[PDB]
């Protein structure tokens, strides 16, 4: 039938209203709610430049 209208599907889903919104944007123009972020600090990378495995 119809898959997207001359647009991309790289929109981020909201948590409050749960509505798709442009990625570039930060705040949700739907519920004016800014997406949250979780760090979950557990350990610290003793290394700064390179990285071991
Ligand atoms: Zn929203």
Swiss-Prot record:
Location of this chain's protein in the cell: Nucleus
Q: Which residues of the full protein are shown?
A: 300 to 339 of 490
* Native source organism of the sequence: Homo sapiens
State the disease linkage annotated in the record: Bone marrow failure syndrome 6: A form of bone marrow failure syndrome, a heterogeneous group of life-threatening disorders characterized by hematopoietic defects in association with a range of variable extra-hematopoietic manifestations. BMFS6 is an autosomal dominant form characterized by intermittent neutropenia, lymphopenia, or anemia associated with hypocellular bone marrow, and increased susceptibility to cancer.
Q: Which gene encodes it?
A: MDM4
Annotated protein name in UniProt:
Protein Mdm4
Q: How would you summarize where this protein is expressed among tissues? A: Expressed in all tissues tested with high levels in thymus.
Describe the protein's quaternary organization and the partners it interacts with.
Answer: Interacts with MDM2. Interacts with TP53, TP73 and USP2. Found in a trimeric complex with USP2, MDM2 and MDM4. Interacts (phosphorylated) with YWHAG; negatively regulates MDM4 activity toward TP53.
Q: Which domain of life is it from?
A: Eukaryota
Induction section of the entry = Down-regulated by cisplatin (at protein level).
Written domain comment of the UniProt record:
Region I is sufficient for binding TP53 and inhibiting its G1 arrest and apoptosis functions. It also binds TP73. Region II contains most of a central acidic region and a putative C4-type zinc finger. The RING finger domain which coordinates two molecules of zinc mediates the heterooligomerization with MDM2.
Q: According to the UniProt entry, where is the signal peptide? A: none
- Which chain segments does UniProt annotate as zinc-finger regions (RanBP2-type)? 8-37
């Amino acid at each position: 039938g119809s898959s997207g209208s001359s647009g991309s599907e790289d929109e981020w889903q909201c948590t409050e209203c749960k509505k798709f919104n442009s990625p570039s944007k930060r705040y949700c123009f739907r519920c004016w709610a800014l997406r949250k972020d979780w760090y979950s600090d557990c350990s610290k990378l003793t290394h700064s430049g390179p990285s071991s495995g």
